[PDB]
Write a protein that binds this ligand. Structure first.
Ligand SMILES: Nc1ncnc2c1ncn2[C@@H]1O[C@H](COP(=O)(O)OP(=O)(O)O)[C@@H](O)[C@H]1O
Ligand SMILES: Nc1ncnc2c1ncn2[C@@H]1O[C@H](COP(=O)(O)OP(=O)(O)O)[C@@H](O)[C@H]1O
Ligand SMILES: Nc1ncnc2c1ncn2[C@@H]1O[C@H](COP(=O)(O)OP(=O)(O)O)[C@@H](O)[C@H]1O
Ligand SMILES: Nc1ncnc2c1ncn2[C@@H]1O[C@H](COP(=O)(O)OP(=O)(O)O)[C@@H](O)[C@H]1O
Ligand SMILES: Nc1ncnc2c1ncn2[C@@H]1O[C@H](COP(=O)(O)OP(=O)(O)O)[C@@H](O)[C@H]1O
Ligand SMILES: [Mg+2]
Ligand SMILES: [Mg+2]
Ligand SMILES: [Mg+2]
Ligand SMILES: [Mg+2]
Ligand SMILES: [Mg+2]
Lengths: 371, 371, 371, 371, 371
């Protein structure tokens, strides 16, 4: 009876039972299709590889995320990911457990409504609820007032909350996330002389982004130090044994997250995003929001992102307020942990919109906006 | 058996037992309502914040004084303040102690009568009495003849008294008080370039009025000195660390209390108010009223208001009479102290109109006009 | 010798000679800066695009209004707009004609004073005057008593006037204007699934606001009708040929102007703004102000705003007084027409503060407060 | 003093003086080495044949392009091509004229920097500049806004430009070009039964690609017509008198340029390449880029490539925008003509980085990114 | 009902029933014609000797392989080999069993189509299929991912396969095979002084190639050791008792297979062939192809060809990947064994194109490209 907490994130799908501490199913939301063979059912190799099988057969597939910046945009491959999780990764009938789902804020209502329609009509979910990822990360942080800055690979949204009482009029969202960081690493590794153009090469560049790239404090001084051949240069073994010496491109990929004009995404920086979310909030809230700024999402796992977020809000904020950038471990999993917290909550048990209630009112039930 | 002395003032509610020297419950009469969330009982955050809790959650609330210039005008939030005091601030059953209540003079009789009705029928008060604030401040001043000039944030009323023998035909009341001073500080800080429009910003402006504003002697000479950048300029830290340099707006807010045409309240100045209350009194009373003019209420806590009241009555009075402007400390609390004096008085124990007497005669009992 | 009437409005700058009927220069107050190229003077493309040139190059620029809610806040780009008008749009030496300027009421005095300083010291204006926009719109309405309700894209201020005799103590100002309507249309088109985040997309959303949005009578009944797919849905061609079907978002953008809590601007509605400006005025003035309420500014060009202003003041006013909501054509240009009227007036020729008088008294001359 | 414009293209090297209309030196960038004899200096036949001499001795040589997809990858044979041009083809001392050089965009910086090092240190160039081929082709097209789609035998890069103001964040590059078309013609002539495996046979296949292959409109209908023995079949005389009847292989070689999955180059088609370069650009730029799409490079000389580019962007673009595929004559030479235009420009005379300036700053001068 | 598996190889024709382990008919594909007598039917000696009879009468015949590098090029003698097999070697009616046929990849389609036409119209085959030899050798190797390097006497083709999913865009073929090795042994035995010019002498040279020639590790060091008269010299008895001492010509015949420039076949070496077939494949496939490289065909029966293939791919591959050159026994027969595996497969029973289906669709059926 432990309800399912499926973090339906952009990059990877995290899923597991409520009341746990780590998801069982941790695998990327990738559906792979072959590119140099026939789809004959007769010999019948397969047709589609989902997640870790797609990661194994990464070479002969056309890997494509079905979702697009939170918008699902492709229902068939998404549904393939759904039943693949439910019947191969967690191995439970979907009518046995309720399904608590996650999303990015400010989504088009057709996405939430048709996702509810598929969960209720294809899988016959007993009951469900769709929650914002940032409120879940705040509940997993163990506090009541903070700003949760999630940036999960398609989105980068900020949400301020003050002792509960969620503020819908200062939630704001960007598009600069880890996908653009991967594409910028493609555009910047062309300077070294290494061709990266395919989806397998895309996943290799994404792996180099995860394991190799750090973030500096002063970008200009670090560019000054990246003139002599110093310790900023580093090698990396490719899966065919090839070695790439990555020099100044270590720190100049997370520089996009604080200078979005380097890829031409005309928007504010993430520090300016959070500071303007503070400025949209009124006074007497700011003192409790300058001191509990909380990072979340997997793209806050850069080494030194907290001290880059410090000295930069500090330049924007007045210099008499405590700038307490809080970045815990398991920032990848904070949304799932908060979903497991709310799914275990007895007070939350009023919020499970049942399929019976879906047949009672109709598909317009999913925008009642309660907690 | 010590009866309750509840100063039901406009700005803050002062309450405490009789025979004390300071009220236990000192908190503003503010009921706050949320403005960016739902009022769902299920999660059930709260619904209303009263006084100091509203002062803590000042940012996310719509703060609103229920009372209006002495007229209560909103019975539900006022009743919320009543039981919040009686069960959270003083922590006593209201049938255990009698309740001595305060009011501004010349109120509409429905306010006093329905307040008596709520104290007798909702709370089951054993006995009560409603007294004028100025007579209480005179009894706390320790004299028998004087003019008490109370101005408590919605009202500014003057009462002359001569050795007892309260004069109902020279009591006169205005509306110019600290609320209009706060709104004038909003209108005058727009010249500096600081937006103040919300109720949280209203309370911040009220705090600046309390802690920063003094009152001059000659307003024209002080405007003459407020042309060079001199010591009249002063800074102030806001709760988000913002700094406002307040220059000539220090002294030009209490200038409204002696020039009410600056906000368009077409009435007499407070000095002209008191002088005309003297002129409404007959001769052989004036000599004992020019020498015992007593300030009271929290809006007489401006630095130098006594010497501004001097030289100004002196210009109105003939120059052969002692103009003795008396302004003690605890002018905020003088009404409560006089209420504690009368509530301790054995002679006053005839005046406690009981709920039994309320059932004896009816709701018209509250206008017998005795001492 | 025809003096310049420059409507220095928030959205667009209207300017022309006195004694005319329409401004020659009608172009938005926008200074554009490039975002994907170098500012090398050698090839020297340009550096800044002003107004209609910025509107032409809307795609490759960072369009930014220099002004901010009446406050100019950026003197260099504003000065660029000034000399661009004077030397490209009207083509006259600024010392040849006097310059009558417009502003929103309750501005910080540094804005008016430094604007006068730039007009007198950079351009060498012969003489000038700064007038409130609402008094100009009343003079262009051809009446002597009314309430002018201007809402020009950064401000929304109301001014009551009774047979001349301007009342400074009932003029009141808000911040809810067309800029917030554009940002709310961004926040509400995210529900349809159309990304609008850049300044070019901002101007496209502003164009859709001008050409597509109407205003309802009963918002709740119109939301009731916006459940079936009815004629409230409508398409719009984007400059790349894209088509957006706008349904209930037609009428729910001007709903912000009568429900400012939908964006969290905690203030009164525009109807409550005007009604409270009436209540700040005394009786015997109200009968001549309930019958001559005059709309002005470009954001009163919504279809049906007069009948929305009716039935809503009528619910606030007593039901025995004529509620005559007057909304002429050319409400965009009414401030400029009234400026052309006063600039043609021989009686007004005492009010032209010359640069010689600026050197006579000093920069404190601009607050003498005469008509 | 007419500076050298050397189109350093992949296939052939075009070079000539500035201010002309056609290059003097038009010969392929091929260095040939013997394969059935000794390299004895004693008799001393030769050692290497460059370009047209290699084309004459095509049979007994191992013909090899030194460059590789824009990357030079072989400095000695490239330097042989350089001095062979400068001393046999144009016959001028390289210190007499400045050398304007061309390249494909997104090259590894070592290629540009060491090419500058060789031009400055081996040849002692007086001054130089390296320009993108697409900007040169746009300047030779005589317009200011367009998308130049160059595909010169190793690369196929698209560049959007809007009234100057070069956009570095929508330039994107592929590898599918004429080299892969030649290798696909080898792989597809094996079906006819004609062995092509050597570099002489490679050049013969390249000549058949130039002179024989057209491009269809509907590939499926043209495959339908290529079932009956129709006029799509055609003969060709080889240099030994052999005759090959080429049937459906006429049109199915440029089909690779619009179906890159036929050789397994997992990327977008050239139409999808240009359409995604449009989509990377923002709106208000697209209308001026759907109407001025410009082809360039020698591999746009297929018969009917303009009408194949039409009806295919039209299926991708919305059907309300003018799709004006512009394909001039001399698309081979457009880069050289634009180089002759900029090399004649007096405004461009600031951009000639001298060898003196190379000794001033150092070899890092070649990435200042100015026009 | 066991279907025929006829390895239609270049050198010898292997044929036998499915489900066996060795072919019954193992004889060379040679048709012999007399050269010193008349073809009179009257006495009627014979006219043509096929295979082993031609091998017996090797002296008085003009032995000629009908096939040419996979291309059959002579239909009458090939048809003689077909019915000679079917009626003298296996002794079964061809309509009794289906016939699974083998071929080299990239053949001209007329060869496959007319071979199908002869099998269906002359012999009346019930059903058939034509498979690539390398896929058969991989299925006989018992793995799913590898590179099969077949070199059967006319061809030398490499095919990479990854868990099924056959890659048509990295299959590549040469012409250097055992025929050229035999002709090079003719050209190199002229140095010893032994005339070999006839087809009988050709078969004797081929027998010496099979039984006498090994392959070295370092060719230069083995040439260094082939200066003193050492154990590299060896004798051989000819069928007339003649003895040839073969010295350095032992190892210098398979040196052609790794140095194809010694006969002037301008192509890559077999190690460079396989390495470039790896490079044509993408990454994440290479690790499973560097470790399962599989030799096949009879010309991989040289002593030490595995250790020559090692240290040579190892010099080309990076030195951090396992180079596992796998060379089983029965590399001659691996194609036939894999054909017997697929001909026994029940899943493969969809692939038997019947003569009925040949009359259904037509002769274009043989290019449907399924497994
Ligand atoms: N060590 C790391 N450093 C920087 N980024 C990381 C690291 N590990 C993971 N990431 C980023 O986190 C992403 C996956 O986490 P997350 O954003 O939570 O997925 P989702 O998109 O589902 O929210 C990866 O795409 C990667 O970009
Ligand atoms: N130091 C001060 N200077 C000027 N005014 C003050 C000061 N302290 C308090 N006040 C005024 O006193 C008010 C509260 O006191 P009081 O008038 O007694 O409340 P009530 O309205 O209940 O009578 C505040 O609203 C403030 O305007
Ligand atoms: N047809 C229309 N319907 C609604 N609003 C309009 C219309 N036309 C113009 N507007 C509004 O009027 C504004 C420009 O007029 P105005 O407010 O006079 O400019 P300013 O800010 O200079 O006063 C635009 O920003 C737009 O928001
Ligand atoms: N008539 C033609 N039809 C198709 N392609 C052609 C034709 N003429 C030339 N080409 C192609 O143009 C190439 C040479 O031109 P170009 O691409 O400008 O050289 P570069 O590689 O130097 O840019 C040749 O390799 C050939 O592939
Ligand atoms: N012991 C051996 N050493 C080297 N090569 C051999 C040996 N035995 C056979 N061969 C080669 O194998 C060839 C026959 O095998 P194979 O290539 O399978 O025939 P096919 O051409 O039908 O594929 C002979 O022509 C010979 O060149
Ligand atoms: Mg995630
Ligand atoms: Mg009080
Ligand atoms: Mg305007
Ligand atoms: Mg070229
Ligand atoms: Mg064989």
């Amino acid at each position: 009876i432990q309800p399912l907490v499926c973090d339906n994130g952009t990059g990877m799908v995290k899923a597991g039972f409520a009341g746990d501490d780590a998801p069982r199913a941790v695998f990327p939301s990738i559906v792979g299709r072959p590119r140099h063979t026939g789809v004959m059912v007769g010999m019948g190799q397969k047709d589609a590889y989902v997640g870790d099988e797609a990661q194994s057969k990464r070479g002969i597939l056309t890997l494509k995320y079905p979702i697009e910046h939170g918008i699902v945009s492709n229902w068939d491959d998404m549904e393939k990911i759904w039943h693949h999780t439910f019947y191969n990764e967690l191995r439970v009938a979907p009518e046995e457990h309720p399904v608590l789902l996650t999303e990015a804020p400010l989504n088009p209502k057709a996405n939430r409504e048709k996702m509810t329609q598929i969960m209720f009509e294809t899988f016959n979910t007993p009951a469900m609820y769709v929650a914002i990822q940032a409120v879940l990360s705040l509940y997993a942080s163990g506090r009541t007032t903070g700003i949760v800055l999630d940036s999960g690979d398609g989105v980068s949204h900020t949400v301020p909350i003050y002792e509960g009482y969620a503020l819908p009029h200062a939630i704001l969202r960007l598009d600069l996330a880890g996908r653009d960081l991967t594409d910028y690493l493609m555009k910047i590794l062309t300077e070294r002389g290494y061709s990266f153009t395919t989806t397998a090469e895309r996943e290799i560049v994404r792996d180099m982004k995860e394991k190799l790239a750090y973030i500096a404090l002063d970008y200009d001084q670090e560019m000054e130090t990246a003139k002599t051949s110093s310790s900023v240069e580093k090698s990396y073994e490719l899966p065919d044994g090839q070695v790439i010496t990555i020099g100044a491109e270590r720190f100049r990929c997370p520089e996009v997250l604080f200078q979005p004009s380097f890829i031409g995404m005309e928007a504010a920086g993430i520090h300016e995003t959070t500071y303007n979310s503070i400025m949209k909030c009124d006074v007497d809230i700011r003192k409790d929001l300058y001191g509990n700024i909380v990072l979340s999402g997997g793209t806050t796992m850069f080494p030194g992102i907290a001290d880059r977020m410090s000295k930069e809000i500090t330049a924007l904020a007045p210099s008499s307020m405590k700038i307490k950038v809080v970045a815990p471990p398991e920032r990848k999993y904070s949304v799932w942990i908060g979903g497991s917290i709310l799914a275990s909550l007895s007070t939350f048990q009023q919020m499970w919109i049942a399929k019976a209630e879906y047949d009672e009112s109709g598909p317009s039930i999913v925008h009642r906006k309660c907690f």
